[PDB]
Enzyme design. Structure first.
Site, PDB file in Angstrom:
ATOM      1  N   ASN A 118       8.606  -7.892  43.807  1.00  0.00           N
ATOM      2  CA  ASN A 118       8.312  -7.698  42.393  1.00  0.00           C
ATOM      3  C   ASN A 118       6.840  -8.013  42.208  1.00  0.00           C
ATOM      4  OD1 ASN A 118      11.030  -7.275  42.131  1.00  0.00           O
ATOM      5  ND2 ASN A 118      11.375  -8.914  40.646  1.00  0.00           N
ATOM      6  N   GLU A 133      10.451  -4.205  41.339  1.00  0.00           N
ATOM      7  CA  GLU A 133      10.047  -4.327  39.937  1.00  0.00           C
ATOM      8  C   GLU A 133       8.563  -4.026  39.845  1.00  0.00           C
ATOM      9  OE1 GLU A 133       8.984  -8.056  38.059  1.00  0.00           O
ATOM     10  OE2 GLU A 133      10.770  -7.917  36.784  1.00  0.00           O
ATOM     11  N   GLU A 144      13.859 -13.420  41.887  1.00  0.00           N
ATOM     12  CA  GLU A 144      12.756 -14.293  41.485  1.00  0.00           C
ATOM     13  C   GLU A 144      13.136 -15.768  41.368  1.00  0.00           C
ATOM     14  OE1 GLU A 144      10.156 -10.865  39.138  1.00  0.00           O
ATOM     15  OE2 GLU A 144      10.799 -12.637  38.058  1.00  0.00           O
ATOM     16  N   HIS A 172      20.566 -12.806  38.386  1.00  0.00           N
ATOM     17  CA  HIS A 172      19.357 -12.526  37.623  1.00  0.00           C
ATOM     18  C   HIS A 172      19.332 -13.439  36.404  1.00  0.00           C
ATOM     19  CE1 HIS A 172      16.133  -9.202  37.057  1.00  0.00           C
ATOM     20  NE2 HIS A 172      15.851 -10.169  36.209  1.00  0.00           N
ATOM     21  N   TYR A 193       3.420  -7.593  39.584  1.00  0.00           N
ATOM     22  CA  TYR A 193       2.820  -7.373  38.279  1.00  0.00           C
ATOM     23  C   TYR A 193       1.335  -7.690  38.294  1.00  0.00           C
ATOM     24  CZ  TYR A 193       7.127  -6.698  35.661  1.00  0.00           C
ATOM     25  OH  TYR A 193       8.302  -6.193  35.166  1.00  0.00           O
ATOM     26  N   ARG A 216      18.908  -0.105  39.980  1.00  0.00           N
ATOM     27  CA  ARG A 216      18.980  -1.528  40.281  1.00  0.00           C
ATOM     28  C   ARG A 216      19.420  -2.261  39.021  1.00  0.00           C
ATOM     29  NH1 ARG A 216      14.720  -5.981  40.408  1.00  0.00           N
ATOM     30  NH2 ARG A 216      16.172  -7.571  41.176  1.00  0.00           N
TER      31      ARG A 216
HETATM   32  C1  LIG Z   1      10.581  -9.211  36.342  1.00  0.00           C
HETATM   33  O1  LIG Z   1       9.630  -9.248  35.203  1.00  0.00           O
HETATM   34  C2  LIG Z   1      10.119  -8.528  34.033  1.00  0.00           C
HETATM   35  C3  LIG Z   1       9.017  -8.550  32.999  1.00  0.00           C
HETATM   36  O2  LIG Z   1       8.676  -9.861  32.630  1.00  0.00           O
HETATM   37  C4  LIG Z   1      11.418  -9.187  33.560  1.00  0.00           C
HETATM   38  O3  LIG Z   1      11.902  -8.509  32.407  1.00  0.00           O
HETATM   39  C5  LIG Z   1      12.415  -9.102  34.679  1.00  0.00           C
HETATM   40  O4  LIG Z   1      13.647  -9.750  34.305  1.00  0.00           O
HETATM   41  C6  LIG Z   1      11.883  -9.823  35.869  1.00  0.00           C
HETATM   42  F1  LIG Z   1      12.781  -9.722  36.946  1.00  0.00           F
END
Ligand SMILES: *[C@H]1O[C@H](CO)[C@@H](O)[C@H](O)[C@H]1F
Length: 440
Positions: free
Chosen positions: A290, A349, A163, A118, A292, A74
């Site tokens: 994505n 992600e 995002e 992006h 985290y 990706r």
């Molecule tokens: C998703 O989060 C990461 C970590 O902060 C970033 O580097 C990516 O660009 C983002 F899409």
């Protein structure tokens, strides 16, 4: 135990974070060139001028993907290389570069998963208000058309935006990302024009495509949990959930903007006629998640919008920048499967930052990152068992890179990047991923 035989296993990058070569082959200026060259905006005084030099060294990146046994990559295409003025003539040299890259990926047996946007908006468009202007949505669709016409014979899987919450809220409201404005009304207007640009681009891409495409969007989602069952804390959790998640999920699902957030934003909310909302809800072939962290929310009436603060859990593991809560990935996937229409789903992600160093033996002993992957992959197996239609997983990131306002100082790679010599080295977690995937 076992993932489906056709599961997609990849790693992910973004153009400004890795490419360098910022003035080469006709590339224009992006908002992130302007922002990173503004004194004080990047924590460590670095820029993306060189980054990982992947514009020249993408062959080495392919070698890493092959060594890891991945079947997909990706990556994003830099709008400033394709249409350097944002709206205007194409730069054929930029298209030719990505055409060669795509052929090199396919020759290596790696499926390209391409992100169109992006975060690297051409600066000339920001000079005309950027995502604060409807015109930017129109010209984004034109850019999407151009790229699909030339690469859509070989690339089936495309995402429009990565995002949009970050682009709108961090870039136009909180001022921590490019372009760096600090105005809530601007941020909410930007969120609408990003979604409109997505919807216009989906239609443009389907009309321009030389073959049927699988088009998605990539959203950062944060599962939110009330700190207590009091009305105030539950309301704070709902507000934060609306601020990050539902504000984007609902219009994409054809449900309009969430009424509770429209009431909360009041006059700051954007003007959304029904014609725009119909465009935004263009049918999608997949959704990228994505993931985290979680948000454990407590009511914070004095704090700024959305008046909800995070209740840190000192019993949970923490990385260099985040709290680790793998179960939240299961929760958000179940919520999407049960409550929203998007399917199939990809994890586009997932990864963590650590204070990685090269040890005396030459390896990088990043045990916390191995444990991070193991824990999140176990939650994906639980989601699959519940019937969630998950089709792939992308580790963030293939290699340490330029981490936005943190610069080069925040290492997310499964491969270590020496930024002085540009050498890449596989970290221990990368070898664990290789061996896990080979077992599948
Ligand atoms: C998703 O989060 C990461 C970590 O902060 C970033 O580097 C990516 O660009 C983002 F899409």
């Amino acid at each position: 135990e076992r993932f489906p035989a056709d599961f997609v296993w990849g790693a992910a990058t973004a153009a400004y974070q890795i490419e360098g070569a910022v003035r080469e082959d006709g590339r224009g200026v992006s908002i992130w060139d302007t922002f990173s060259h503004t004194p004080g905006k990047i924590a460590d005084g670095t820029t993306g001028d060189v980054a990982c030099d992947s514009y020249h060294r993408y062959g080495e990146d392919i070698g890493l993907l092959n060594a890891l046994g991945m079947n997909a990559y990706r990556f994003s295409i830099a709008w400033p290389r394709i249409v350097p003025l944002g709206a205007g003539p194409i730069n054929q040299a930029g298209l030719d570069h990505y055409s060669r890259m795509v052929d090199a990926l396919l020759g290596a047996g790696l499926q390209p998963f391409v992100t169109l946007y992006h975060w690297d908006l051409p600066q000339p468009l920001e000079d005309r208000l950027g995502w604060g202007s409807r015109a930017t949505a129109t010209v984004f669709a034109e850019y999407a058309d151009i790229v699909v016409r030339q690469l859509g014979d070989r690339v089936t899987h495309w995402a429009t935006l990565n995002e949009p919450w970050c682009s709108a809220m961090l870039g136009y409201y909180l001022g921590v990302h490019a372009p760096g404005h600090t105005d809530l009304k601007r941020g909410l207007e930007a969120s609408h024009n990003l979604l409109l640009g997505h919807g216009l681009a989906v239609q443009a891409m389907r009309a321009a495509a030389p073959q049927p495409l699988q088009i998605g969007i990539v959203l950062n989602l944060t599962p939110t949990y009330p700190a207590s069952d009091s009305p105030e804390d539950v309301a704070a959790a709902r507000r934060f959930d609306g601020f990050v998640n539902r504000w984007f999920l609902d219009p994409l699902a054809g449900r309009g903007y969430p009424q509770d957030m429209l009431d909360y934003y009041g006059a700051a909310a954007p003007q959304a006629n029904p014609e725009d909302l119909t465009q935004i809800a263009a049918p999608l072939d997949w959704l990228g998640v994505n993931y985290y962290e979680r948000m454990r929310a407590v009511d914070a009436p004095d704090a700024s919008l959305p008046q909800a603060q995070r209740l840190d859990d000192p019993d949970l593991p923490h990385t260099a920048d985040r709290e680790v809560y793998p179960e939240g990935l299961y929760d958000i996937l179940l919520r999407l499967h049960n409550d929203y229409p998007f399917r199939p789903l990809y994890i586009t992600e997932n990864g963590c930052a650590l204070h990685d160093e090269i040890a005396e033996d030459g390896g990088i002993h990043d045990g916390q990152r191995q444990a991070f992957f193991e824990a999140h992959l176990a939650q994906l197996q639980r989601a699959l068992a519940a019937g969630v239609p998950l089709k792939g997983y992308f580790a963030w990131s293939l290699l340490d890179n330029f981490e936005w306002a943190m610069g080069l100082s925040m290492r997310y790679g499964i491969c270590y990047t020496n930024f002085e010599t540009l050498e890449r080295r596989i970290k221990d977690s990368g070898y664990w991923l290789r061996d896990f995937i080979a077992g599948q």
